[PDB]
Homo-oligomer: A and B are copies of this chain.
Amino acid sequence: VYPKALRDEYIMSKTLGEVKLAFERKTCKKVAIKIISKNVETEIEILKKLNHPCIIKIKNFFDAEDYYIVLELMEGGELFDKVVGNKRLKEATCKLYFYQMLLAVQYLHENGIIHRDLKPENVLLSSQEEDCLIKITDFGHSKILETSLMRTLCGTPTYLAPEVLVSVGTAGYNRAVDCWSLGVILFICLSGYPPFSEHRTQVSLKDQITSGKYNFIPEVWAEVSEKALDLVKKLLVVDPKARFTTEEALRHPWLQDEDMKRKFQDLLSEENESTALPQVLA
Contact = CB atoms under 8 A, between A and B. Distances in A.
Given A157-B206, A158-B196, A158-B197, A163 B141 contact: no
15 contacts: A117-B159, A119-B158, A119-B159, A141-B152, A143-B148, A157-B205, A157-B206, A157-B209, A158-B194, A158-B196, A159-B185, A160-B180, A163-B177, A165-B206, A165-B210
Nearest to A152: B141
Contact of A165 (B197, B209, B240): B209
Query: Which of A143, A170, A210 has the most C-beta atoms of chain B within 10 angstroms of its own C-beta?
Result: A210
B157 A181 contact: no
B176 A159 contact: no
Contact of A163 (B152, B157, B158, B176): B176
Given A141-B148, A141-B151, A151-B141, A212 B162 contact: yes
A184 B196 contact: no
Interface string A212-233: 1000000000000000000000
A162 B240 CA distance: 9
**Which label, helix, strand, loop or mixed, suits the secondary structure of the A interface?**
helix
A27 interface: no
Contact of A177 (B118, B141, B158, B161): B161
A205 B143 CA distance: 32
A161 B176 contact: yes
A64 interface: no
A118 B161 CA distance: 11
B238 A162 contact: yes
A48 to B, nearest CB: 22
A156 interface: yes
Given A157-B196, A196-B157, A162 B205 contact: no
A282 interface: no
A36 interface: no
A159 B141 contact: no
A166 interface: yes
A189 B163 CA distance: 23
